[PDB]
Amino acid sequence: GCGYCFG
Amino acid sequence: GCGYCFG
Amino acid sequence: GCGYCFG
Amino acid sequence: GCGYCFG
Amino acid sequence: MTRLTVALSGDCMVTRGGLITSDPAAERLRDLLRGTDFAVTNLEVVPSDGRGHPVHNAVGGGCLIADSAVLDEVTAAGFSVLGCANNHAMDLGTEGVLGTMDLLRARGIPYAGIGADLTGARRPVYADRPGGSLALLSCTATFLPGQEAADPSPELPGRPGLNPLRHTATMQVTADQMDVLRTIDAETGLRARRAEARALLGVDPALLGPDRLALFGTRFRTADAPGFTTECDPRDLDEIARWVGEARLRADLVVVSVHSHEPGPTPETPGEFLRVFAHRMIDEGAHAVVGHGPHFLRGVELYRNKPIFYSLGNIVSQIELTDRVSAEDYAKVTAERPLTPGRYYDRLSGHGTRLFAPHRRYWQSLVPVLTFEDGTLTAARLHPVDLGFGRPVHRRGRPRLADRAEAEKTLTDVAQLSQPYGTAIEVMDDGTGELALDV
Amino acid sequence: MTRLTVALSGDCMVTRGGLITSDPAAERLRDLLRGTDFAVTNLEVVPSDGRGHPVHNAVGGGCLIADSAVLDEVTAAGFSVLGCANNHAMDLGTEGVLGTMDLLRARGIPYAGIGADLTGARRPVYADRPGGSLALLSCTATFLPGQEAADPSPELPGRPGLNPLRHTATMQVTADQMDVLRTIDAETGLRARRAEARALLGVDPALLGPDRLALFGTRFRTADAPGFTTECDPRDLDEIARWVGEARLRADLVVVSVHSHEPGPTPETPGEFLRVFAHRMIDEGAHAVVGHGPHFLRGVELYRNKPIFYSLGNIVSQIELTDRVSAEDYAKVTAERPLTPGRYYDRLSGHGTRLFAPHRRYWQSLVPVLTFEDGTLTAARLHPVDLGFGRPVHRRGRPRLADRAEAEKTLTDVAQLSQPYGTAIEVMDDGTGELALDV
Amino acid sequence: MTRLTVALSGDCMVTRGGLITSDPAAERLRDLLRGTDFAVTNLEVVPSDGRGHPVHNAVGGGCLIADSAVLDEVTAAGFSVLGCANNHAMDLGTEGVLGTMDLLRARGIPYAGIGADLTGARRPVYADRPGGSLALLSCTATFLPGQEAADPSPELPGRPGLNPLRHTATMQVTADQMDVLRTIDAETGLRARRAEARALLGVDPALLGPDRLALFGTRFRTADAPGFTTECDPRDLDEIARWVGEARLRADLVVVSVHSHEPGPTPETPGEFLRVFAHRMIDEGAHAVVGHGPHFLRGVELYRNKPIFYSLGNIVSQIELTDRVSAEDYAKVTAERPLTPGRYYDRLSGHGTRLFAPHRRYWQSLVPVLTFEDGTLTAARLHPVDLGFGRPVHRRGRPRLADRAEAEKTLTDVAQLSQPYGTAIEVMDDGTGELALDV
Ligand SMILES: [Ca+2]
Ligand SMILES: [Ca+2]
Ligand SMILES: [Ca+2]
Ligand SMILES: [Ca+2]
């Protein structure tokens, strides 16, 4: 769930 | 607290 | 119950 | 998450 | 298509075993209760395995606490849905009422009227059987302030307690009587002791208007003739009615059980607020209203073809047999030596010359058995119950179907108490009866 | 030599007692279930004594939580092996599913499809009886991502959850349609917002090839004609099949229960991935595949002389009678006052004008009773079940054997839904039927 | 009269001890932090003694779990108020976040952003010191759906979780682009698979209007030119702002800490919704907004004389040193033998050729030290922090005050990233700086 995110 | 209750 | 008390 | 679901 | 029977009863103040004796009239009462689809009673005792602490309930006549084994006496007798909101459910405090809920749930006993918060105490309980379902809601108009349950806030939990039906009393007084009350307030110095509250609140909390007055913790209103009125708390009335409309959607039958000691103009008449409450319950869709509290019978009313039993008295009455008397209860009896429980109750009643023992009205009961067909009342049988007036203290209070002669006397009593409501009764040869219905 | 009977059923969404009413047609359903060697159902509800926290399951239609006493309704009705993998087992989170396992094990109820880790959720459960043994495996293709159970690592424990059957959908689009999608990706600035992911990962995660595309969280593939395909997750398919081959060595009968809401080209057809899955299960040695999810019936297929029931609908449907509605569920209904559960469901369905109530397909069910002799299917009886379409909300959803006229209509429905698979049905005078077998 | 200093920092991803090395530049960072009245950081790791279960967080880069002893590293370094709302606080589920709250409260560490329910996660925490008080609110725009905390209902408890700042993205497309999307929807058969939802809901959930569209789980709107817009969830924005107005009444300083990975048109610009959010916070009375998430620095904005730090990057970065890797995390790396954690991170980054290691922007940080006098910002010092780019994996990620040459480069970066907002910086001889203020 992030669409267009690491750590 | 009963105003105007036993048991 | 206070008859005639804040905080 | 169901894409193209009740109960 | 759907045919259901409901047995109703009043206060179940059970403190001992052997609730149903070997008397055939007592065994036939159990057969009657166990033959119905639902059998409701008001659990007027704290069943306990030791959780909680006694509260000061002198107004209620002392603490009413019993071994949790009495719950097996209640169910084996035939009662299957318990109303728990009354002036004794909180006799062991919030921990006690949580202990009661634990005990009832572990025994699989449906109950209503108490909860871990206000919503849980207001909720109906749904008792499901093969033939259909009954919703029981249970509330009480008699309790110590603060014992009502509370709902949670964003920051604090709720408070375990009972489902309340609060009410206010207003004294109607003439204008000259009102002037004397204000004069007493000013001349005694009572008004001077509210000078601080005037500055903090901005106004006198005793001035509700020029013709309204709050003095001595009582409401006074100017009227052309002296009088006395009672009114339900609007929030309790709207909320209980709200839950009745909810229960009517989810059960075949909705029964509202209400505990109320409050007397009307006479001891046998219900408080006016109770009658408004009972009418509202049926207006909202309840099929019956069962009342209790006073320990004697009150009248029966048919309203929109549904019965209101303003008081079914006691179905079990073993107060004087309790083995758990608190220190504050003991202190109400002057004694030159430490007292055992039985001796304490003997001295409290003046060795039986006062309180409930001398009067026969406190030892007659009634078990209505109602028959509904698709929510329509088609029969309302009346079974007089004898609680053993005049028997030794260890025997009286256990219920049995009254014999013919005593049942007829009880049925006469119910008819007379119900006459102001236009209720009529048919009488069987055995002293049992039934309400005359319009259906 | 070995002769075993298995009753199958769909979603058991039980929230109230009295599951089997005094209706003779309902008592005969219990007699039917209790006369079989094994009776399987999909536990589509979280039985709870209070452990866990509600998850946001708006896609699933809200939380489905009930008093743990409903488990005694399930077993007393005759169900004896529970499938638990579905989109509601996790309605109270990981703590809730651990609470369910505790409740089922303490009542001695065999169950499959959930576990403290992924292996425990994938395992078959073995139900042993004097005549033989049945292995039940339970998986679900419908659930919120992350709800699948997880196996432990050398350093971290597993995660309690359900046995998953994941699947991917691919949109087939023409080359000119694909060009427009890439153009929209570039011209909206969507591609620019993946510039960081390009440097970190080394490539665009949206480029899976020049004729493949991942945009808007969806798979696109260039094709000569537009279309839509679904495919099982290869790891879930291989692993479930792996456990079926294991179960076939250790039980007389192996049944795979699969929850799947996903529709095919039409609402009544199963997803293509589900049909590939069901064929694989029988290829690996399963004796039956029982499906559920959509709340209506789907067709029946005979594959290598074993039955596939793509959907048996609901065997119990009491969603609207739940007394445990979460705050996020309440928020889906605009209200100028706090709502009780029943009023919430009335407003959610527009006072019964939408959702499942108006349509009769959601209130017909089917209980197949299969007879196996040494693993060979020798009979497949079909017992139509009526769930009370059009009855009041508190009555509908409880199962009974449909009367002749309604059973015939349901049997016609099953025959029509099964016709694309070449399934034929013999019909009895009472409206029950049985599959035509080649054996 | 009232003079308070606040140190701000970004992501504290600590997994090992010895956070402050014997390097004088690292000891001077601790001296700096311990010399302020309050020192805030974002706890970007689950401290654990073993409670909970790993969630599948592949999108977040894997699980981030560490020995609870790292909390003593955080406090001994000088951090004294923790923001906890981020995409990793829920890495051990609801039980994990309850375990974190237990660990923080037992160590006396003020924290915000997580709670046993939604209100508790939204609340500010009040840190009181002799010179005054600071209120910290903590929210995150990056998290897995369902991880947000939930408030209780009358019947069900809440759900432990994080304080959410949800947001929606809308794709602006031309009318001809919109027509192709609808055509793809119809021609692939995707629209046919919503036929069931049409009957149940009464309308197509994909039709939000004739110029609005919900397809592939994405919002599309017809516009004259293609574009991309983001907007805060109105309920989250109003509720967080509501709590800021509450905190402003009860503390000298109010700081809002917001986690946000979401990129704007370029990786270094914040999402437009984040800028609207930050402006609203100061409009409601916040004294500073500290952002983090992207692991690199973003610009600084002065709005109504209060600073917005859209991203302070990482203050501690020890992801690759974690000793607790979940089974689903291990599965992202193909291996012909079981992997140890360090080897897993080596293979995950391609032995250091991708992910964060090769790029210097991920290893520079900034610690602002703000001075307020009666709520007026009078100084905003900027202390560049070096995280050891190019050092061995076991050494990089620990913070120290950058030397002059590297501090000047970082200060140039901040100035350039802040230039679109009109922010100016004064530069000291040692490479530290401060914002140019209008006060
Ligand atoms: Ca005081
Ligand atoms: Ca009483
Ligand atoms: Ca389902
Ligand atoms: Ca993050």
Distance from the Cα of residue E53 to its chain's centroid: 23
- Counting ligands in written order, which one lies closest to the CA of residue C7? 1
Buried b (16+ CB within 10 A) or exposed e, E311-331: bbbbbbbbbbbbebbbeebee
Q: Which DSSP category does F362 fall into?
A: G
Considering CB atoms only, which of A1, A4, A6 is closest to F193? A4
Q: What tokens appear for G87 in the block?
A: 């995409």
Amino acid code (one letter) for G256: V
Q: How many CB atoms lie within 10 A of CB F339?
A: 20
Is E82 in contact with E103 (CB distance < 8 Å)?
A: no
Is G384 in contact with G401 (CB distance < 8 Å)?
A: yes
- Counting ligands in written order, which one lies closest to the CA of residue F44? 3
Please, which residues bridge with residue F111 across strands?
Answer: F82
Q: What tokens appear for A2 in the block?
A: 């992030």
Contact across the interface for D7 and F144, Cβ inside 8 Å? no
For residue E50, count CB atoms less than 10 angstroms from its CB and return exposed for 0-12, middle for 13-18, buried for 19 or more: exposed
Amino acid code (one letter) for F156: L
Nearest to F230 by CA among F165, F162, F301, F312: F165
Spatial CB neighbours of E23, under 8 Å, sequence gap ≥ 6: E400
Contact across the interface for E123 and F323, Cβ inside 8 Å? yes
Contact across the interface for G200 and D3, Cβ inside 8 Å? no
User: Residue C7 C-alpha to ligand 1 middle, in angstroms?
Assistant: 5
Q: Does G155 touch chain E if contact means CB atoms closer than 8 Å?
A: yes
**Rounded CA gap, G329 and G56, in Å?**
8
The beta-strand segments (E) located in F53-185 are 65-67, 81-83, 111-112, 114-115, 125-129, 132-140, 161-162, 167-173
How do strand F433-435 and strand F376-386 relate by DSSP bridges? antiparallel
Q: Which chains touch B (3 or more CB pairs under 8 A)?
A: E
Q: Does C7 touch chain E if contact means CB atoms closer than 8 Å?
A: no
**Rounded CA gap, G358 and G354, in Å?**
6
Tell me which residue has tokens 């009286």: E396
Contact across the interface for E143 and B7, Cβ inside 8 Å? no
Task: Output phi, psi for G386, to 5 deg.
Answer: -105, 130
For residue G24, count CB atoms less than 10 angstroms from its CB and return exposed for 0-12, middle for 13-18, buried for 19 or more: exposed
Q: Do chains A and G touch (3 or more CB pairs under 8 A)?
A: yes
**Rounded CA gap, E299 and E308, in Å?**
8
Contact across the interface for F194 and A4, Cβ inside 8 Å? yes
Is G137 in contact with G154 (CB distance < 8 Å)?
A: no
Contact across the interface for E142 and B5, Cβ inside 8 Å? yes
The H or E element that residue G330 is part of is helix G327-330
Q: How many CB atoms lie within 10 A of CB G18?
A: 9
Task: Note every long-range contact of F196-200, with CB atoms under 8 Å and residues 24 or more positions apart, other chains counting.
Answer: F196/G263, F196/G267, F196/G294, F199/G359, F200/A6, F200/G354, F200/G355, F200/G356
Spatial CB neighbours of G79, under 8 Å, sequence gap ≥ 6: G9, G12, G33, G39, G40, G41
**HEC assignment per residue over F232-261:** ECHHHHHHHHHHHHHHHHHCCEEEEEEECC
Spatial CB neighbours of G226, under 8 Å, sequence gap ≥ 6: F184, F187, F188, F189, G171, G172, G173, G174, G177
The beta-strand segments (E) located in G332-402 are 364-373, 376-386, 400-401
Nearest to E37 by CA among E130, E154, E122: E130
**Rounded CA gap, G362 and F90, in Å?**
38
Please report, for residues F17, G232, G254, G263, G296, the alpha-carbon distance to residue G299 in angstroms, rounded to integers and kept in the order given: 62, 20, 21, 13, 10
**HEC assignment per residue over E135-185:** EEEEEECCCCCCCECECCCCCCCCECEECECCEEEEEEECHHHHHHHHHHH
Q: What tokens appear for F205 in the block?
A: 């995660």
- Counting ligands in written order, which one lies closest to the CA of residue E142? 2
**Rounded CA gap, F111 and G85, in Å?**
38
Q: What tokens appear for E160 in the block?
A: 């375990």
Q: Which DSSP category does F150 fall into?
A: B
Considering CB atoms only, which of G119, G154, G155 is closest to E154? G119
**Rounded CA gap, G300 and G420, in Å?**
9
How many angstroms separate the CA of residue E398 from the nearest CA in chain C? 39
Spatial CB neighbours of E67, under 8 Å, sequence gap ≥ 6: E15, E47, E48
Considering CB atoms only, which of F143, F144, F319 is closest to D7? F319
Nearest to G220 by CA among G183, G188, G276, G174: G174
In total, the C-beta contacts within 8 angstroms joining chain E to chain F are 41
Please, which residues bridge with residue E215 across strands?
Answer: E218
Considering CB atoms only, which of F145, F190, F200 is closest to A4? F190
Nearest to E140 by CA among E120, E162, E160, E111: E162
Rg of the Cα atoms in chain E: 23
How do strand G425-427 and strand G433-435 relate by DSSP bridges? antiparallel
Question: What SS3 class is residue E194?
Answer: helix
Nearest to F323 by CA among E375, E96, G150, E110: E110
Contact across the interface for G355 and A6, Cβ inside 8 Å? yes
Is E426 in contact with E418 (CB distance < 8 Å)?
A: no
Q: Sign of the CA dihedral G420, G421, G422, G428?
A: negative
Residues of F with CB under 8 A from a CB of D: 11, 13, 44, 59-61, 64, 87-88, 142-145, 169, 261-263, 293, 295, 317, 319, 355-356
Question: What SS3 class is residue F262?
Answer: coil
DSSP string, F63-80: --EEETTHHHHHHHHT--
Task: Output phi, psi for F418, to 5 deg.
Answer: -95, -10
The H or E element that residue G114 is part of is strand G114-115
Alpha-helical regions (H) of E272-399: 272-283, 327-330, 341-348
Q: What tokens appear for F374 in the block?
A: 């040494």
Q: What tokens appear for F400 in the block?
A: 């009974």
User: Residue E319 C-alpha to ligand 2 middle, in angstroms?
Assistant: 11
Is F381 in contact with F434 (CB distance < 8 Å)?
A: yes
Give me the residues near ligand 4 (ion), CB cutoff below 5 Å.
G 87
Question: What SS3 class is residue G295?
Answer: coil
Contact across the interface for G119 and E155, Cβ inside 8 Å? yes
The beta-strand segments (E) located in E189-320 are 212-215, 218-222, 227-232, 253-259, 288-292, 300-303, 306-309, 314-317
Q: Does A7 touch chain F if contact means CB atoms closer than 8 Å?
A: no
Q: Compute the C-alpha angle G22/G28/G29, nearest 5°.
A: 100
How many angstroms separate the CA of residue G335 from the nearest CA in chain D? 30
**Rounded CA gap, E376 and E363, in Å?**
32
- Counting ligands in written order, which one lies closest to the CA of residue C5? 1
Distance from the Cα of residue E312 to its chain's centroid: 9
How many angstroms separate the CA of residue F89 from the nearest CA in chain E? 24
**Rounded CA gap, D7 and F259, in Å?**
12
Spatial CB neighbours of G391, under 8 Å, sequence gap ≥ 6: none
Nearest to E237 by CA among E108, E160, E141: E141
**Rounded CA gap, G265 and G269, in Å?**
7
Q: Does D4 touch chain G if contact means CB atoms closer than 8 Å?
A: yes
Please report, for residues G112, G235, G261, G425, the alpha-carbon distance to residue G275 in angstroms, rounded to integers and kept in the order given: 21, 17, 13, 21
Contact across the interface for G217 and D6, Cβ inside 8 Å? no
Stated resolution in angstroms: 2.2
Q: What tokens appear for E65 in the block?
A: 């606490």
Q: What is the number of H-type helices and E-type strands within chain E? A: 11, 25
User: Residue G205 C-alpha to ligand 3 middle, in angstroms?
Assistant: 19
Nearest to F9 by CA among F49, F36, F47, F48: F36
Please report, for residues F5, F15, F55, F69, G405, the alpha-carbon distance to residue F73 in angstroms, rounded to integers and kept in the order given: 22, 10, 25, 7, 75
Amino acid code (one letter) for F162: L
Q: How many CB atoms lie within 10 A of CB E111?
A: 22
User: Residue C3 C-alpha to ligand 1 middle, in angstroms?
Assistant: 15
